[PDB]
Design a protein around this ligand. Sequence first.
Ligand SMILES: CCCCCCCCCCCCCCCC(=O)O
Ligand SMILES: CCCCCCCCCCCCCCCC(=O)O
Ligand SMILES: CCCCCCCCCCCCCC(=O)O
Ligand SMILES: CCCCCCCCCCCCCC(=O)O
Lengths: 251, 251, 58, 58, 273, 273
Amino acid sequence: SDRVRSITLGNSTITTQECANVVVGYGVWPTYLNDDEATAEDQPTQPDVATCRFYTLESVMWQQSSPGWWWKFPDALSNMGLFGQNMQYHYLGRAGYTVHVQCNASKFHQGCLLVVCVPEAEMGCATLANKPDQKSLSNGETANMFESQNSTGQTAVQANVINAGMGVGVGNLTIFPHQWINLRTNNSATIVMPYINSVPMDNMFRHNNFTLMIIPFAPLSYSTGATTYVPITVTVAPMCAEYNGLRLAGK
Amino acid sequence: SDRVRSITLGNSTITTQECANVVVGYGVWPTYLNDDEATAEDQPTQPDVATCRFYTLESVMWQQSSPGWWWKFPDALSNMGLFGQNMQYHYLGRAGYTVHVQCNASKFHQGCLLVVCVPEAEMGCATLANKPDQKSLSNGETANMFESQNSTGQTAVQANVINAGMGVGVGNLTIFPHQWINLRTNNSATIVMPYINSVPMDNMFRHNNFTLMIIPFAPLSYSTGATTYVPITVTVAPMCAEYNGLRLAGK
Amino acid sequence: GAQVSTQKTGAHEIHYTNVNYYKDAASNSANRQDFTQDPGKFTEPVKDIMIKSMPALN
Amino acid sequence: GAQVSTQKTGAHEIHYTNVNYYKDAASNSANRQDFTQDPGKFTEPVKDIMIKSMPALN
Amino acid sequence: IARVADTIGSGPVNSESIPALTAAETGHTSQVVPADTMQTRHVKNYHSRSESTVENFLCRSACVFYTTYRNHGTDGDNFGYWVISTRQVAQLRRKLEMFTYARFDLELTFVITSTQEQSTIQGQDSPVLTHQIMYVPPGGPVPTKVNSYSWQTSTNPSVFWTEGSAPPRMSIPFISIGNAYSMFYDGWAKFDKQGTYGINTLNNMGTLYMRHVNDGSPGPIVSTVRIYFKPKHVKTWVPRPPRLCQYQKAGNVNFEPTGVTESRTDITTMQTT
Amino acid sequence: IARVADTIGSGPVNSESIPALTAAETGHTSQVVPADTMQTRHVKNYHSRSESTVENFLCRSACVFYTTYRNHGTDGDNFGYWVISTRQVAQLRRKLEMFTYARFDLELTFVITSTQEQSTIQGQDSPVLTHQIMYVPPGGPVPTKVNSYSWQTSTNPSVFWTEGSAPPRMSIPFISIGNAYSMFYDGWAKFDKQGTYGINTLNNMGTLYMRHVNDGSPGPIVSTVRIYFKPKHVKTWVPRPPRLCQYQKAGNVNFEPTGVTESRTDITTMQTT
Ligand SMILES: CCCCCCCCCCCCCCCC(=O)O
Ligand SMILES: CCCCCCCCCCCCCCCC(=O)O
Ligand SMILES: CCCCCCCCCCCCCC(=O)O
Ligand SMILES: CCCCCCCCCCCCCC(=O)O
């Protein structure tokens, strides 16, 4: 039916028997930069198979008091195979992403997760005068956790989930490309993100520029005697990745 | 004239004002593997710009008593940029090479170097019962030196130059694609090597399968008061490099 | 299916017959008269044409 | 009554002759090149067509 | 041509089609190719299955028995016999028993070798030996002595062979009374189910008899005849799992229970082997 | 026709064309003929290169090994084996190693000869001997005794031969898993580069096993089998310099350093030699 779906990228495949649909960005499928949009003159690199493939991040464990998590991209993929390698040797880069969040339950479990990709998600620090340090913003392959109370710390991020680290209403995050994992309905959510930026290409190490947030709006719940370990796995795949500006490796 | 020449590969260029010609393998220019010659089924990777480019190895110093040097490929390029990276993450690989050896003198200097690419250059050990260890065969980016006397060592290579490490006549090495740097005539030699092997693709870490030898047949010579530091630089570029069998990195 | 070929004879002043008996092509006899020659691979592997009467280098 | 067939040769870059001498068909040589294949008997013995891309069970 | 399938090119996919998911309960073996779960290139495959045909797999000469007979005997009683069967050797029995029914012609070959025995009968200068193999179909008169009248072979087929020459060979057609040879039989011989149970019920092929046509010389000699079977013009039906346990008897399928495979350390040890 | 070039007539010259001057640094081998540096006549050359083709140069039967096996043994342990290789003889190894890659079919021939041994077992009158050569491809069951079950040769190819007749011969196709046989290999067997280095990495051709099919007689006997290889339907790639140093091992190219040529008295001595 329309609940089944498969996605093959590179030498990787993801099957889902209980999905909702695919959310495709803003109706735009990711493509390669055209000649009339390009400004960098050297012939770009396009690995096209070794990089445009699925990578699985580190899983988290959904608990009854989990406020939520977030990843930064492509910082989360900065050490993933040849995709991270091309990022180090190149000054400029460009990709779109297929994002697949997967969480299965027992049909007696309940809870609803919001899965959203926020472009240019600039986050505030817990101390108003300071700035968040590098690790609080993006731990790479590891998720940074939202809090269900005000954060403290000179370099900490204001991770109170009610504002989503950005100073907005967390219920208003549905303006971005989003989906819901509702345990009674579906065990996965997938979003295809095109490349969004104010320039045709950017440095992949000092800019993201979208964040993945997973926020439980309905908490996890079950009766005693059921499985209590409900993990959420994240599998991202860059699409149409190209690179410009080859030189020595860094960072 | 025909003594000038330029070669542009990737973001790299080599100009020579005093060359002889280009030796192209056995008359075969390197190409990509065709569908009727291939046997591996997964779609190969072709970086095509980030890897098919020029890499400069470590220079040696031509002296009046230098027997010669040799490099193994692609072991010499196993740590060179993204070409070495794709070698680590892939089980199979395939490339051809442009080889550019460059040595300039003062027009009062004399000496003739043989520059040859030997396919499947299996080398013998100094101890007849043993086998040469891994480092004696190929130091990677560093040249292994021929000797002008019998070698000793349990794991050493028999590097007496008169047999070229292979048990043949060193003057008969002109059966392979070769060239000469004669200091009165030209300061560089270039050879385009196609992919030669008994299989369409091979593992780039446990097989070479050609060696580059630089043997002075006429020794370096000059009168006192002239420059005595005459280095030989080697610049190789893989051509039409493709890769199959992506997995975790190694070796 | 019999093949009549020309025997090896002398020049400056003569057929044999062949039948294949076995089902495999490896069971056949040797290709004693496959006269092909392409020495240019090894003697002229250079990129430019390199005419004989002309100087090799300008 | 001689049968000229194609020998077994290699692919990607060759006939033999056969005469029967005996009156019984069992005296002949083996049928080394009877290449027929019908794996569907054992791999797809089901009643319905069972298309690949479709789900096996609704 | 038994040429395998070419590999088709396939790019990225994102759709509802689920080639990798199926129901193995149906008994259907999935027809997934590598081009369904990954981006493949195009490969023109020139490999052929010409060597795994049942004719080529079975058309190999195999020794099925050997027995010995002497020249002196008592009294005698110096001749050989073999009740024909294909189940006294392990190698050919396991190949034939990968199928339940088979129809084929045979190429029968013999390899007869003679040996001098220990004695003190010097000196010995013995002329060349000549052997006679006689085949007696079921019901025919059996040889009782090495010189009995049955060796006349008026109607029984016999081959005479002198040592030093090519090993004798003859063809046998498909001779069973059924429409196919049975490798396996799951019934009895008698209607009340008493008596022989199994494949021995259908074993009525006949017997071979061997002797020296020469009169015995003073020096003792023992000859051994090796019979070789070669299936020809083969047709097989209903393949079955290969024999896992070692054979014990020729008449039945009796076995000693064997493990499924060789064991290893744990579920993740890559040292296999 | 592999006919050489005719010599063209040429008179005196005085011009700017310089056929004799060239640059040997280019790697190009000059194509000067005698008609470029002297007045030549016209010669219709009828000489042909039919004998230097790689087929004719290689299509000669060559002995590659011989081994001995006896009839008595203990216990026994009276049979022969050879792990197939082309590198245990000097003559054929140097011809095959003038190229880096070769594809060919083989003509395999055997020459089996038997010898009487010293003893006091008079008197001996032994019938003709029959030998069995069995080929076991890699992975198949190996013979452990001279009468073990593996000699049944249900699927393993074997040739039976009686002495006094023509030496046995059979054809083998090109059987490598690669696209060409390798004479030279410049890598290791393991990915970490530990273990066997060189051409021994690709040596997985199989093994030959020999025995007497006869039972052993009282008189002792030793037989020697000589294997002969003949390349057929040859294709060679990447010629390399002929081996100058004498071989030492079969698995590797290890050598003792040798002079380039035979020395002479001085740079002008015409006594060469
Ligand atoms: C002089 C030689 C004549 C010998 C003729 C022998 C004929 C005997 C029949 C051989 C076929 C037996 C095949 C049985 C197969 C089975 O039981 O599975
Ligand atoms: C009953 C006789 C059968 C014997 C069959 C022998 C087959 C063995 C393969 C021989 C070819 C080996 C050629 C290797 C060439 C090389 O390593 O350079
Ligand atoms: C080597 C010389 C072989 C001489 C011919 C003997 C073999 C039989 C030839 C039969 C010719 C008719 C077969 C055919 O139609 O090709
Ligand atoms: C196995 C190769 C056999 C070669 C041919 C030898 C046998 C005689 C052939 C006679 C051909 C004419 C008979 C006919 O009309 O079919």
